[PDB]
Design a protein around this motif. Structure first.
Motif, short mmCIF file in Angstrom:
data_model
loop_
_atom_site.label_atom_id
_atom_site.label_comp_id
_atom_site.label_asym_id
_atom_site.label_seq_id
_atom_site.Cartn_x
_atom_site.Cartn_y
_atom_site.Cartn_z
N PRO A 104 -89.33 48.27 23.89
CA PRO A 104 -88.32 48.17 24.78
C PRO A 104 -88.31 47.41 25.92
O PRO A 104 -87.28 46.62 26.47
N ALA A 105 -89.45 47.33 26.80
CA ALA A 105 -89.37 46.73 27.79
C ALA A 105 -89.36 45.23 27.50
O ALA A 105 -88.79 44.28 28.21
N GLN A 106 -90.02 44.56 26.52
CA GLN A 106 -90.25 43.43 25.94
C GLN A 106 -88.67 42.78 25.86
O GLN A 106 -88.33 41.85 26.31
N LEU A 107 -88.01 43.61 24.98
CA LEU A 107 -86.89 43.16 24.48
C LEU A 107 -85.71 43.12 25.75
O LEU A 107 -84.99 42.26 25.96
N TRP A 108 -85.86 44.02 26.69
CA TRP A 108 -85.09 43.66 27.84
C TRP A 108 -85.58 42.59 28.65
O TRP A 108 -84.26 41.90 29.06
N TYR A 109 -86.67 42.15 28.63
CA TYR A 109 -86.97 40.69 29.35
C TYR A 109 -86.22 39.74 28.57
O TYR A 109 -85.70 38.75 29.09
N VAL A 164 -85.89 33.50 38.34
CA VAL A 164 -86.82 33.19 39.29
C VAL A 164 -87.56 34.52 39.37
O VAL A 164 -89.00 34.16 39.25
N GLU A 165 -87.03 35.79 39.32
CA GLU A 165 -87.63 36.92 39.05
C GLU A 165 -88.43 36.78 37.94
O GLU A 165 -89.30 37.48 37.44
N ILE A 166 -87.41 36.09 36.71
CA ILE A 166 -87.74 36.27 35.38
C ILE A 166 -89.19 35.74 35.29
O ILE A 166 -89.77 36.00 34.32
N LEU A 167 -89.43 34.65 36.29
CA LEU A 167 -90.57 34.05 36.34
C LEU A 167 -91.93 35.10 36.24
O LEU A 167 -92.97 34.70 35.89
N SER A 168 -91.51 36.40 36.46
CA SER A 168 -92.48 37.60 36.42
C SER A 168 -93.12 37.64 35.35
O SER A 168 -94.15 38.24 35.23
N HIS A 186 -89.13 32.85 24.63
CA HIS A 186 -88.02 32.91 25.16
C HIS A 186 -87.84 32.48 26.30
O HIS A 186 -86.98 31.83 26.70
N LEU A 187 -88.83 32.46 27.35
CA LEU A 187 -88.82 31.88 28.59
C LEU A 187 -88.83 30.69 28.41
O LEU A 187 -87.96 29.85 29.28
N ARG A 188 -89.83 29.90 27.65
CA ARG A 188 -89.59 28.71 27.43
C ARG A 188 -88.08 28.24 27.00
O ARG A 188 -87.46 27.15 27.38
N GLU A 189 -87.54 28.92 25.81
CA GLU A 189 -86.33 28.67 25.33
C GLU A 189 -84.98 28.50 26.67
O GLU A 189 -84.48 27.43 26.65
#
Lengths: 274, 193, 62
Positions: free
Chosen positions: A137-142, A159-163, A192-195
């Motif tokens: 679930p943590a992963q899914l949230w991100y 930005v925070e996503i960069l976390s 997903h980040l790259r996407e």
């Protein structure tokens, strides 16, 4: 019309009754979902409320447009509720709920950017201790949080996503361990980040089970005990190894016995007291 | 998407909905279903008709139109609510009339489409009411017309016993489902057909 | 009776292989250190450090 409140009420009752300890709520919450809902819900007990909260956004998927906007209106209330609430079960509930609100696209990116909840997902993501279940679930949230941003032109959150970058150490671990499930979750984060922001960023085998068996072969790491003063001290020290289940062997005519290394210390302690 | 598709939804207005005690909810659900249907393909169209106790009436007549569709439906139904034909004052509904209207519309749409290529159409009935003997000839006339036309008539019986509708699906080669749990209406509409 | 303790490794081999370890023990160079004693036919008190060698040698040997 009158029937509607009654029927759905009974399930509201059932969820209320077995609300506290386990995870009864999920199936019932779904039924409840279809039939100011958020405002009214808020008063009710948190768990289960969150469950209803989680599934309702999912369930949405004309009047529907109206529904989404209505939900958007009290996204804050749920958000206030989400924090403050913040076991593994609870933790799963809070992110699952947050994730769900995110896909809805009701949440405000600003506001989300500076909030404890985002810190908390990477925190659990960082720690090795968290279980696989919390991890997913943590992963899914991100993933959903990043999914929510379909712009990044105007999204402080990205930005925070960069976390996510912090996660690599965690992925190194996890990799060290044979935790495939955890690693897969990491990859999803990366992908997903790259996407989001990609634009911005630049027989035969019979011998192989035999070759596996050649890597296993037995012996045990062990203390031997000898020269015991009289039979009562063999039998006490022996029975107190046997109840500890760490007797590898015994011979009462030798007055001699063997303990594997993991209960050397419980024997060393019993030998000192009695 | 190559084939234009017209789905006509006939909604049984009967005050049986009172037993349902909600109509408002049923409308909301039907609206969601319609929006999805229109969204699936460009070529999909929808027509909505109300089969009331006294007579059949047209609620609405593309997805771009959906906003229009929502308003037109809410408004139209409210007008229908009138006291006459109240509760089981009148057990039956004018399905025959509704079906006739539906076939007329399908025909007209088809002719225009004939200029172009073929059109596919199916009729969905949300049935609250009961059938009656007097109704038999009229209803069957419409049913048989549909079968000949090869237009399937599907029916979702929330409650009541409309045998004729059950027969209608069989002849037509449509689908008939008596719903256990009427609140699951949305699932049936999406899933069932 | 807790007179004496000795860290050792207890090998629970079969009644076939045990005698090879003993054989391994003797007639060997830099060996004979290997077996502390034969507690049972099946089990022996042996080595510690030698265990890696005993196993490997057995493997290499037929």
């Amino acid at each position: 019309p009158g029937v509607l409140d009654r029927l759905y009420g009974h399930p509201a009752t059932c969820l209320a009754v077995f609300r506290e300890l386990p995870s009864l709520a999920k199936n019932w919450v779904m039924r409840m979902l279809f039939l100011k809902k958020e405002f009214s819900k808020a008063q009710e007990e948190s768990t289960g409320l969150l469950s209803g909260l989680r599934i309702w956004h999912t369930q949405l998927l004309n009047l529907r447009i109206a529904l989404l906007g209505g939900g958007k209106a009290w996204s804050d209330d749920t958000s206030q509720l989400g924090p403050d609430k913040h076991v593994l079960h609870f933790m799963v509930g809070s992110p699952s709920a947050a994730v769900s609100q995110d896909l809805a696209q009701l949440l405000s990116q600003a506001g989300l950017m500076k909030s404890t909840e985002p810190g908390e997902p990477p925190c659990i993501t960082s720690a090795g201790f968290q279980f696989l279940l919390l991890d997913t679930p943590a992963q899914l949230w991100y993933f959903m949080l990043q999914y929510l941003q379909t712009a990044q032109s105007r999204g402080m959150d990205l930005v925070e996503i960069l976390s996510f970058l912090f996660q690599l150490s965690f992925s190194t671990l996890g990799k060290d361990y044979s935790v495939e499930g955890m690693s897969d979750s990491l990859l999803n984060f990366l992908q997903h980040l790259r996407e989001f922001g990609l634009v911005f960023q630049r027989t035969d085998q019979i011998r192989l089970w035999e070759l596996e068996r050649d890597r296993l072969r037995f012996t045990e790491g062990v203390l031997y005990n000898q020269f015991l003063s009289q039979v009562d001290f063999e039998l006490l020290l022996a029975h107190a190894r046997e109840l500890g289940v760490l007797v590898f062997e015994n011979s009462a005519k030798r007055l001699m016995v063997v303990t594997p290394a993991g209960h050397s210390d419980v024997k060393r302690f019993w030998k000192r007291q009695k | 998407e190559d084939e234009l598709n017209l789905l006509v939804i006939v909604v049984d207005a009967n005050p049986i909905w009172w037993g349902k005690q909600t109509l408002s909810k049923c409308i909301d659900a039907v609206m969601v279903l319609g929006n999805s249907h229109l969204f699936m393909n460009r070529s999909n169209k929808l027509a909505v008709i109300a089969s009331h106790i006294q007579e059949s009436r047209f609620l609405y007549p593309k997805y771009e139109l959906l906003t229009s569709a929502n308003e037109v439906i809410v408004e139209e139904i409210k007008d229908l609510m009138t006291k006459s034909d109240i509760k089981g004052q009148h057990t039956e509904t004018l399905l025959a009339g509704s079906l006739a209207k539906a076939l007329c519309y399908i025909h007209r749409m088809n002719k225009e489409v004939k200029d172009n290529q073929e059109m596919k159409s199916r009729i969905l009935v949300i049935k609250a009411a009961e059938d009656s003997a007097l109704q038999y000839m009229n209803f069957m006339n419409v049913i048989f017309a549909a079968q000949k036309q090869n237009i399937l008539i599907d029916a979702c019986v929330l409650d009541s016993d409309s045998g004729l509708l059950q027969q209608a699906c069989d002849i037509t080669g449509g689908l008939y489902l008596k719903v256990p749990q009427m609140p699951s209406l949305l699932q049936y509409l999406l899933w069932v057909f | 009776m807790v007179n004496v303790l000795k860290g050792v490794l207890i090998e629970c081999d079969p009644a076939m292989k045990q005698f090879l370890l003993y054989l391994d023990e003797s007639n060997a160079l830099g060996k004979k250190f290997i077996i502390q004693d034969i507690d049972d036919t099946h089990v022996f008190v042996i080595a510690e450090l030698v265990n890696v060698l005993q196993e490997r040698v057995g493997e290499l040997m037929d």
